């Protein structure tokens, strides 16, 4: 493992993906368990649920995102999504489905009327939080991944697919797998206009 | 201390600390590299790169903790307020420095006009960008050595906050952030069983 700052630095979008991993699969689940114990949440609530997708479960989640696009959008937009959809996603190795549990936020909002239009806010926030740890971690050990948010179109399919709780509200989508190219160019904004110190 | 753990590390080791104190284990131009780092690199939807941070140290940093207790103040009655202002002087307002977490509405604003099948979406993603920036300096802020605790005084000081630095007023204030040395440890972390909360098919 890199240090925290030189893992969070090498941390970027990958498209180019494949389906292959340096690691054992029980080592993906370990990334998925340390994110799970350690991000925080607000009042320790424990909101995020977090769903790993192989093999054939992962080539199944990009089928679903498929079939949803293709009742939404006309047919040769629809064959150009696929080509795409099936060249970058669903050639990696596995997808990290993030939820959001609707209870938990719901119960918080019920027992602590004061803070209750924070909540959804503040899940949210746990959500990526879990999202950047495990997006590090992901590409620390040598995959490729991306961030995609093909929810809310998919999501009941999804829970049913997996018979998933229906209050798992589904939040993103990070397909992974071992890179074949490099990322591309990002532009920074000046951090003088971004960050101010005061003494 | 200075030397950084691995990524997984540094993550195990933060935690929430209250008893802080005033005193660095780092260099302010550090601190400051921290911040930076973080922006730098941490996502944002579209690259739009909306997070603003702000750093306050010394007399800027108890300024801010002072503008929570004059908050609290008016809306905390009498022999209750006594007990918030030493919770606040004792666990916030004595460490060494506080980060401020904004979120630029006028790039939220412009990702909504520019992109208008989008537009709903950019104020959650900007929140979510937020968020990760929190953890990020979060982490590093405890691996170099201070505690630190999240805070959310917001929306009762944002006004006063921008009036008192001359702050943009798109800038949303998200979170507060104050940090220093610890002087205790942290407590008791209930954990869920990990298998309610991740499932994995094949
Ligand atoms: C909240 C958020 C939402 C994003 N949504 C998408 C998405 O739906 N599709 C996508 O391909 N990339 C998405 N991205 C990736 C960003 O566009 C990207 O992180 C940014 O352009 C910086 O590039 P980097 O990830 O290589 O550092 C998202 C990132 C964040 C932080
Ligand atoms: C979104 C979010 C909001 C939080 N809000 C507060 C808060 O306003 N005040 C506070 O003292 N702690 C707050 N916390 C800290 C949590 O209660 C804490 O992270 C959780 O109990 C786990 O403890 P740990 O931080 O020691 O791992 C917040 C954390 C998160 C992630
Ligand atoms: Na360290």
Redesign the interface.
């Known amino acids: ?9 090498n ?1 970027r ?1 990958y498209y180019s993906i494949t389906d292959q991993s340096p690691i054992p ?1 029980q080592e993906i ?1 370990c990334i ?9 949440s607000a009042f ?1 609530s ?1 909101s ?10 992962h080539k199944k989640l990009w089928n679903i995102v498929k079939d949803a696009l293709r009742k939404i959008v006309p047919g040769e937009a629809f064959a150009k999504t696929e080509e795409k959809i099936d060249n970058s996603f669903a050639c990696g190795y596995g997808t990290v489905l993030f939820f959001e549990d609707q209870k938990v936020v719901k119960g918080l909002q019920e027992a602590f009327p004061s803070y209750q239009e ?1 909540f959804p ?1 503040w899940s ?6 879990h ?3 495990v ?3 992901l590409e ?1 050990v040598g995959f490729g991944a991306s ?1 995609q ?1 093909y929810n809310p179109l998919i999501d009941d399919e999804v829970r049913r697919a ?1 018979n ?1 709780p229906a209050h798992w509200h589904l939040i993103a989508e990070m397909p992974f797998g071992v890179p074949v190219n490099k990322p591309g160019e ?4 000046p ?1 003088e206009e ?6």
């Not at 998925?32 to 925080?40: D, F, M, S, Y």
């Not at 949210?124 to 939080?129: D, E, G, I, R, V």
């Not at 990002?186 to 904004?189: C, I, M, S, V, W």
């Open positions: 493992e890199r240090t925290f700052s030189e893992a969070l630095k941390r979008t699969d689940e998925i368990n340390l994110a799970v114990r350690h991000v925080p320790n424990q995020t649920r977090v769903v790993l997708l192989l093999g054939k479960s924070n806010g949210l926030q746990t959500s990526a939080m999202q950047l740890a997006w590090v971690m620390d961030l948010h997996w998933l990002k532009e920074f904004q951090l971004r960050i101010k110190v005061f003494k």
